[PDB]
Ligand binder design. Structure first.
Ligand SMILES: CCCCCCCCCCCCCCCCCC(=O)OC[C@H](COP(=O)([O-])OCC(O)COP(=O)([O-])OC[C@@H](COC(=O)CCCCCCCCCCCCCCCCC)OC(=O)CCCCCCCCCCCCCCCCC)OC(=O)CCCCCCCCCCCCCCCCC
Ligand SMILES: CCCCCCCCCCCCCCCCCC(=O)OC[C@H](COP(=O)([O-])OCC[N+](C)(C)C)OC(=O)CCCCCCCCCCCCCCCCC
Ligand SMILES: CCCCCCCCCCCCCCCCCC(=O)OC[C@H](COP(=O)(O)OCCN)OC(=O)CCCCCCCCCCCCCCCCC
Ligand SMILES: CCCCCCCCCCCCCCCCCC(=O)OC[C@H](COP(=O)(O)OCCN)OC(=O)CCCCCCCCCCCCCCCCC
Ligand SMILES: CCCCCCCCCCCCCCCCCC(=O)OC[C@H](COP(=O)(O)OCCN)OC(=O)CCCCCCCCCCCCCCCCC
Ligand SMILES: Nc1ncnc2c1ncn2[C@@H]1O[C@H](COP(=O)(O)O)[C@@H](O)[C@H]1O
Lengths: 347, 51, 115, 49, 55, 320, 55
């Protein structure tokens, strides 16, 4: 792609999400989501192969259906409120339709059926854009309509996402589908604590964006998209195996790492509201995520899968890749737990 | 974990680029025939048009 | 009310010129007179095969330029406002954005047909 | 001489070193200036002098 | 003079015609040396190629 | 680094330096076709940059001090042991073939890098478009297995699709008898073990598969043995070629920008040579790979990045 | 019997086989847009009729 056009398309993706974030009118919310979708479609088709066309078709149909449900929720809000302020909705039908729309846009289960498909079909950079930057605009709108979100609906979506994203990553050897089912589970974590304390939802969003950006930057730096290709990293650059070790142990929620920070705080905000069974099921379900994380750390760091002879050529060439903010994101994704009370800046 | 369903699933390619499976485009065969004001009375152009 | 009467009249004596076109003459129907016309010889294949569009990018961009005359069309009315320099700047912004789109569609050879 | 080619990191990019040191020294003097302004404003707003 | 066109369609103008003709005529003679000396094609084509090359 | 999207944006277009002297030329032929001087001679009349043929130690010549690394560090293979016993049990045949394919991929990347960065054409010897014929000879003489051919086909299928063919392919007809005569006059005691059927298989995969598939995507100049001794003949034919075939016609600034951003990243070039296909000829197990990697790190000038080594005498490292 | 089979059976292996079986059931989809959006329709119909999430 022409890099001027790449800059304009990425600035238009950012412009769509910022128009969702800053606007006080529902039509401008919908315009921002349409602009975000319309600009992110060629980022998925950067390489022009049939898997990118398939992934882009599936993504376009899911996001178009979600935008239809969003605009019907907006028109029903216009009927039952006569206005357009981005705030709570004045009808549980519009509340349900906008919650379904935002659950489809996040790819939360049982609308999860596009996230591993689309994430497998596209490159790692567009997968990073999809799994981090597109998780900001619907979470903004969910943060803005929480006086009208049905409790049972968003908790059903949350724990169904946590369970299905936990089970999905266990049957995987492709790293992009692993990160996609990890995304399903973690969006379930974020939306579970939405009606209890949305500051913890923002904290989980930021820590998950840091850890996901760390893992995709490590994957792009290693030029690996499968488990068995990532397993040759010890023979090429052994520090990257240490970084994926500490980052996948962070994403599993093990202390003393910062990925234990959101989850624990979510439990800290759900036992206050006298819900003990639900974060217990959430925590026990997170062991599935930790299991396929430990599978990747066994295949990469803690053992040594056999390499080839041609690896001896790649010993002679260092990495000329723009590993943008990789040590900063690695330190933020692993050693941030003693700074856990920083979350009050997100209030 | 291979099952009965997950047994025909070959692993995906390395550069994520699939061979094009070159199904025939089937060019539309016009019969620019003899009864025509342009073909001068007696001329049967069997042409193949891509549109 | 008058529009429905006028449309019903036009549709009626457009479909009463067809029902006296099919029922008035004498028919001699046989299964070679109703064969497909292909200049005398029998047609090779169907005419329901894909007829590949060469002008497809212009066909898509027509859908993005036809919205402009749903946007540029209130300009006889928008000139009647009391904030007029703002209106003029936004109008010339819309025609300029259409023009920049058309310039970009030229320069990447998008208005040319394929093959 | 060892290398058969000229490596890209053979010589220090003195523009980049100068920008790095200037940016870092500016951030330190602005941090210390902001902290002194903050302790002055705190001792002023509460009479803790 | 740098002749602009040849007048023929598809016949592109040669920038250096003299050296190109010397190339092609010595190349014809080099290929044509592989023919027996009693063959009339060799004698006649060497004759006309040397005539054109001397011109 | 040095080249990126910002250089393309701020003015460095790769077709502003693309002259009519910018021609990528590959001189091919059998084992003793005499092309070795010919390419240099074609490089010295057209003013082009000659690259020698990629042996095992081309990557050793391009990095470090340029001196050849020991064979356990680069290659783990030997051409001479392939000439001794081509049907060996350690799988030296396909291991040599795969290392030579990776070295020629690196060489072709270097050729395109010089061609697109400087605008000067590069004369090569047996690029990646012609390497495969040796594999096929190795497959016809029973030296390798079909799984080795499948591994080579997967690596070639994902690597050669990203690069362009040359402009000119020069092929030198030397028959099997004269190749054997030049081998006996060469004096290499391992090279005189090359069989007649292996040379005939090299000539057959040349004349049956390589040249019918390159004659549409580039221009072939098939010379014989006697007429290729004159460099003026070959360059005299090159300078009057009507360049019309191939995908070099439809390359703008953007496509060759993408090609150049691919080419200068050498690990992205060498990404798919080590695909995880566990083949017994090329798979080095865990402890041997760890031992040879930790021995490679302790080599002089190899322990760090190429400007960060005090043992060979790099200065100002605390400011780099 | 106990500490290689039955106490090995009841806690870890039942849970391991259950998570293996559920992981194989979830991920065994065919990648079809038709079946995914038909499941979306069934989700909307359960949310409206069966579960009263529009209330
Ligand atoms: C307001 C909020 C600001 C938040 C931070 C903004 C900066 C970081 C994010 C943006 C980014 O991607 O920057 C690119 C990034 C380079 O990407 P990289 O992959 O990390 O660099 C690899 C090598 O270091 C590249 O090395 P090099 O060969 O280019 O040479 C050295 C290079 C040369 O660069 C220069 O000389 C730059 C000079 C110009 C600077 C701007 C002048 C105007 O300097 C550095 O790389 C220095 C280290 C940079 C650290 C980046 C992270 C900064 C902090 C991020 C947030 C941390 C939060 C912690 C909170 C903990 C508790 C929650 O940084 C820079 O280019 C300069 C960073 C300057 C930081 C200023 C912070 C205060 C701003 C107020
Ligand atoms: C090592 C393997 C086995 C592990 C066993 C672990 C312990 C077994 C029991 C765990 C129960 C769940 C946590 C209980 C926390 C109690 C906190 C509390 O104050 O509770 C009072 C609260 C009471 O609610 P309340 O406090 O909001 O009520 C208000 C106060 N009154 C009572 C006056 C109205 O209890 C609960 O909410 C429910 C407690 C039972 C939860 C049942 C679900 C979990 C079932 C067992 C799971 C066991 C592990 C599963 C994994 C196995 C391996 C994969
Ligand atoms: C509650 C709401 C809070 C909102 C906070 C907003 C904060 C900023 C936005 C965060 C969201 C994620 C941002 C990153 C999205 C992906 C960007 C991307 O893909 O950039 C492209 C680029 C590609 O690099 P390259 O290797 O050249 O790729 C080859 C080309 N195929 O590069 C990459 O792919 C590499 C990654 C580049 C960016 C990484 C750093 C940003 C994200 C990590 C957090 C950093 C800490 C500071 C911010 C904290 C909050 C997130
Ligand atoms: C600032 C004023 C307002 C400007 C914005 C509003 C514009 C209104 C009109 C809408 C135009 C939309 C489409 C424009 C497309 C322009 C790009 C273009 O077509 O460039 C190609 C063309 C040469 O065509 P070619 O590439 O050979 O095409 C082959 C097939 N015919 O290239 C050319 O022919 C060269 C075009 C550029 C030079 C034109 C110079 C005209 C100067 C007039 C006087 C000054 C006017 C003020 C503007 C500054 C002009 C420099
Ligand atoms: C007291 C507590 C008892 C239960 C503890 C948890 C389960 C037992 C310990 C973890 C699994 C142990 C193990 O070795 O499982 C192996 C099995 C197959 O693993 P696989 O990847 O096929 O191995 C490759 C070659 N061995 O792995 C599997 O089949 C995967 C099972 C994953 C289970 C993760 C834990 C889930 C618990 C929460 C459920 C909700
Ligand atoms: N892929 C290959 N497999 C085996 N031998 C090769 C391969 N490529 C080049 N060679 C050898 O390289 C030498 C080239 O000949 P020359 O460089 O003219 O001495 C011959 O010994 C060839 O057999």
């Amino acid at each position: 792609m022409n890099p001027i056009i790449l800059i304009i398309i990425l600035m238009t993706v950012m412009l769509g999400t910022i128009i969702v974030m800053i606007s006080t009118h529902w039509l401008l919310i919908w315009i921002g989501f349409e602009m975000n979708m319309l600009a992110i479609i060629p980022i998925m088709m950067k390489k022009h192969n049939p898997r990118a066309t398939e992934a882009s078709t599936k993504y376009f149909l899911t996001q178009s259906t979600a935008s239809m449900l969003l605009m019907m929720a907006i028109i029903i809000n216009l009927m039952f409120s006569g206005q357009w302020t981005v705030m709570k909705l004045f009808n549980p039908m519009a509340s349900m339709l906008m919650t379904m729309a935002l659950a489809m846009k996040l790819g939360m289960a049982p609308f999860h059926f596009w996230v591993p498909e689309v994430t497998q079909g596209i490159p790692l950079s567009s997968g990073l854009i999809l799994l981090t930057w597109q998780k900001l605009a619907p979470m903004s709108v969910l943060y803005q309509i929480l006086p009208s979100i049905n409790l049972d609906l968003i908790l059903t979506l949350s724990i169904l996402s946590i369970t299905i994203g936990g089970w999905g990553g266990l049957n995987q050897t492709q790293l992009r589908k692993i990160m996609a089912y990890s995304s399903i589970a973690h969006m379930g974590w974020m939306t579970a604590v939405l009606l209890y304390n949305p500051t913890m939802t923002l904290l989980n969003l930021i820590i998950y964006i840091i850890m996901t950006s760390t893992m995709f930057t490590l994957f792009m730096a290693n030029s690996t998209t499968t488990t068995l290709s990532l397993s040759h990293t010890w023979n090429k650059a052994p520090i990257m195996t240490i970084l994926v070790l500490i980052t996948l142990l962070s994403m599993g929620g093990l202390p003393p790492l910062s990925g234990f920070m959101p989850k624990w705080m979510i439990i800290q905000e759900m036992t206050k509201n006298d819900s003990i069974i639900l974060p217990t099921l959430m925590a026990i379900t997170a062991l599935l995520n930790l299991y396929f994380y430990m599978r990747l750390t066994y295949s990469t760091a803690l053992t040594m899968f056999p390499s080839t002879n041609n690896m001896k050529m790649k010993w002679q060439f260092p990495t000329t890749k723009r590993m943008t903010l990789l040590p900063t994101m690695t330190v933020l994704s692993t050693m941030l737990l003693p700074l856990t009370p920083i979350l009050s800046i997100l209030e | 974990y291979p099952t009965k369903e997950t047994a025909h699933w070959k692993p995906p390619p390395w550069n994520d680029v699939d061979p094009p499976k070159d199904t025939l485009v089937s060019n539309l065969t016009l019969n620019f025939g003899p009864q025509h004001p342009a073909a001068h009375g007696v001329l049967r152009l069997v042409m193949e048009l891509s549109g | 009310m008058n529009l429905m009467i006028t449309l019903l009249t036009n549709f009626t004596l457009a479909t009463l010129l067809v029902t006296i076109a099919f029922w008035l003459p004498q028919l001699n129907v046989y299964s070679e007179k109703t064969s497909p016309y292909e200049c005398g010889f029998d047609p090779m294949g169907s005419a329901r095969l894909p007829f590949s569009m060469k002008f497809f990018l212009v066909a898509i961009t027509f859908l993005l330029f036809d919205l402009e005359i749903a946007l540029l069309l209130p300009l006889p009315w928008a000139s009647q406002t009391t904030n007029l320099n703002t209106m003029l700047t936004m109008a010339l912004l819309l025609i300029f954005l259409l023009a920049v789109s058309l310039a970009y569609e030229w320069t990447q050879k998008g208005l040319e047909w394929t093959e | 001489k060892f290398y058969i080619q000229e490596p890209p990191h053979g010589s220090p990019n003195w523009l980049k070193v100068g920008l790095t040191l200037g940016t870092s020294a500016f951030l330190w003097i602005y941090l210390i200036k902001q902290h002194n302004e903050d302790v002055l404003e705190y001792k002023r707003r509460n009479g803790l002098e | 003079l740098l002749k602009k066109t040849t007048g023929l369609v598809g016949l592109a103008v040669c920038e250096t015609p003299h050296e190109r003709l010397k190339i092609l005529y010595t190349k014809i003679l080099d290929v044509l040396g592989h023919i027996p000396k009693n063959a009339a094609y060799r004698k006649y084509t060497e004759q006309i190629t040397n005539e054109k090359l001397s011109i | 680094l040095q080249y990126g999207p910002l250089a393309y944006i701020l003015g460095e277009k790769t077709t502003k330096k693309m002259t009519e002297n910018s021609k990528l030329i590959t001189v091919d032929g059998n084992i003793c076709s005499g092309k070795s001087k010919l390419a240099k001679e074609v490089a010295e009349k057209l003013g082009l940059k000659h690259f020698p043929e990629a042996g095992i130690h081309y990557a050793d010549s391009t990095t470090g001090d340029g001196k050849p690394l020991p064979v356990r560090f680069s290659g783990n293979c030997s051409l001479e042991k392939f000439y001794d016993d081509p049907k060996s049990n350690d799988g030296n045949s396909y291991r040599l073939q795969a290392w030579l394919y990776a070295s020629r991929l690196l060489q072709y990347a270097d050729a395109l890098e010089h061609l697109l960065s400087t605008g000067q054409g590069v004369v090569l010897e047996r690029s990646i478009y012609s390497d495969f014929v040796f594999l096929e000879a190795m497959y016809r003489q029973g030296f390798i297995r079909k799984q080795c051919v499948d591994h080579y086909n997967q690596v070639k299928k994902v690597t050669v699709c990203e690069y362009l063919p040359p402009h000119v392919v020069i092929y030198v007809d030397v028959p099997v008898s004269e190749v054997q005569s030049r081998i006996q006059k060469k004096g290499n005691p391992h090279e005189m073990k090359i069989t007649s059927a292996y040379l005939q298989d090299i000539e057959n995969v040349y004349k049956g598969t390589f040249l019918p598939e390159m004659s549409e995507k580039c221009e072939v100049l098939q010379y014989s043995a006697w007429e290729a001794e004159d460099a003026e003949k070959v360059v005299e034919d090159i300078q009057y070629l009507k360049y019309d075939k191939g995908p070099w016609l439809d390359q703008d600034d953007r496509k060759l920008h993408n090609l150049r951003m691919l080419v200068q990243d050498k690990l992205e070039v060498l990404n798919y040579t080590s695909i995880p296909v566990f083949l017994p000829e090329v798979t080095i197990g865990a402890h041997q790979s760890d031992r040879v990697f930790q021995e490679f790190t302790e080599l002089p000038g190899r322990k760090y990045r190429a400007g960060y080594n005090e043992d060979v005498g790099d200065k100002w490292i605390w400011l780099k | 019997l106990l500490d290689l089979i039955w106490l090995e059976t009841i806690l870890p292996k039942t849970i391991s086989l259950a998570q293996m079986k559920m992981s194989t059931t979830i991920t065994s989809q065919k990648g079809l847009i038709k079946l995914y959006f038909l499941s979306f329709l069934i989700t909307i119909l359960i949310s409206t009729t069966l579960l009263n999430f529009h209330e």
